């Protein structure tokens, strides 16, 4: 607060003291936001007790997860889809950026554990110990969860695995060909950048003073007339900073709600099969897979969608 308003001017700094705790309040408010951002990430991604790994041999009955699983040939250990998502999305005035507690590598590791848990043990790892089950049998369980008999899965296993594998491939192709796909994450980046740039530009404002430059005032005028000019810059710069912080608090609240929703989806779509309509994609929910993205999360929802209906005559009873 002090550096933004006064820089290294002791004369300005002394005047700023007459305003009381305002600067302390503003610093406190921004600190609270920063803490919440780490909490938000933890609530979404750190929902696993242990770091699970998939088996060396990827035999899952025809189901291919290579686009969502980590690609070991890349040092970031991101999946093919995650690597695509990551490619697609001041200091001198007392404004600084603090690093996240969890690195992108750590977030990818959490995501990998969640995927490994789901693929090898279904929804069991989210309720207790991870219990292994063959993937086709897990999928048969999930067919029952939507009111479809398990023999339908087993009799059409080849077809189902093919439809799944194609649907995943389309996700990669869609992202690779749609610049606007990740606007929800890009908007957050843009809005924050526009707030910081606006704040810095306000340092060019005179606010009624002879000059926006504090040193110009101090070099040209003596103490009785400089204080009046400085007071005008302090008033404006304090107002500019208060505006910034208020906007950040409002924006933070919106992001928090988004993070709260993401955490719920992780629990109810990834760590289980949901009966809530349109909560985990359109159609009857089977399962979901998380992917990490810059400042956010991407969910791939797998649903069962009825097709090729026929007309029949019916009756309530025989």
């Amino acid at each position: 607060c002090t550096m933004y308003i006064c820089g290294d001017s002791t004369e300005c700094s002394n005047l700023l003291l007459q305003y009381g705790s305002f600067c302390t309040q503003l610093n406190r408010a921004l600190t609270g936001i920063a803490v919440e951002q780490d909490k938000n990430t933890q609530e979404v991604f750190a929902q696993v007790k242990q770091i699970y790994k998939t088996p060396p041999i990827k035999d899952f009955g025809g189901f291919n997860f290579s686009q969502i699983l980590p690609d070991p040939s890349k040092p970031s250990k991101r999946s093919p889809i995650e690597d695509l998502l990551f490619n697609k999305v001041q200091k001198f005035n007392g404004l600084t950026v603090l690093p996240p507690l969890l690195t992108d590598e750590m977030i990818a590791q959490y995501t990998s554990a969640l995927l490994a848990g789901t693929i090898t043990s279904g929804w069991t790892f989210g309720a207790g110990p991870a219990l292994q089950i063959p993937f086709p049998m897990q999928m048969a369980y999930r067919f029952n969860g939507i009111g479809v008999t398990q023999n339908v899965l087993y009799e059409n296993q080849k077809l189902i695995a093919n439809q799944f594998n194609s649907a995943i491939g389309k996700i990669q192709d869609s992202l690779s060909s749609t610049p606007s796909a990740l606007g929800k994450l890009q908007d957050v980046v843009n809005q924050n950048a526009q707030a910081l740039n606006t704040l810095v530009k306000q340092l060019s404002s005179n606010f009624g003073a002879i000059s926006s430059v504090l040193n110009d005032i101090l070099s040209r005028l003596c103490p009785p007339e400089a204080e009046v000019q400085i007071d005008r810059l302090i008033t404006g710069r304090l107002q500019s900073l208060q505006t910034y912080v208020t906007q950040q608090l409002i924006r933070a609240a919106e992001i928090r709600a988004s993070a709260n929703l993401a955490a719920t989806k992780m629990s109810e779509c990834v760590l289980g099969q949901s009966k809530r309509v349109d909560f985990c994609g359109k159609g009857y929910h089977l399962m979901s897979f998380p992917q990490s993205a810059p400042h956010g999360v991407v969910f791939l929802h797998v649903t069962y969608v009825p097709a090729h209906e026929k007309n029949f005559t019916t009756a309530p009873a025989i």
């Binding site: 507690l101 554990a113 693929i119």
Partner: protein, 114 residues
């Protein structure tokens, strides 16, 4: 060069020892010295082990009181390779009844200012 100075401490009810983080700077510009991506950490012993995060420093680094203050890369949890195969299933032969607590705020103090 300028930046924030943060003091890392266990409760004063445990120890009067502290470590200091000089945010955003090199250790060479500051005048148990460890350079983190968060800045220069002085007074903490860096170790190659990993533990659950105690006091967060940033960029994967956390500190704790172990006596002295130490700095480490945080662990995300124990590893577990699940015994997957195409014909193997695990089934519980027992269970436990668990009780857990959840706490939520409902209201604030109702104030009024004339």
């Amino acid at each position: 060069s300028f930046g924030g100075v943060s003091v890392i401490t266990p409760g004063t009810n445990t120890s009067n020892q502290v470590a200091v983080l000089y945010q955003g700077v090199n250790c060479t510009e500051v005048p148990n010295v460890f350079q983190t991506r968060a800045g220069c950490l002085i007074g903490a012993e860096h170790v190659n082990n990993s533990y659950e995060c105690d006091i967060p420093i940033g960029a994967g680094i956390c500190a704790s009181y172990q006596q002295s203050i130490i700095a480490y890369t945080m662990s995300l949890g124990a590893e577990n390779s699940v015994a997957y195969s195409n014909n193997s299933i695990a089934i519980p032969t027992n269970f436990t009844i668990s009780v857990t607590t959840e706490i939520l705020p409902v209201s604030m103090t109702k104030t009024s200012v004339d």
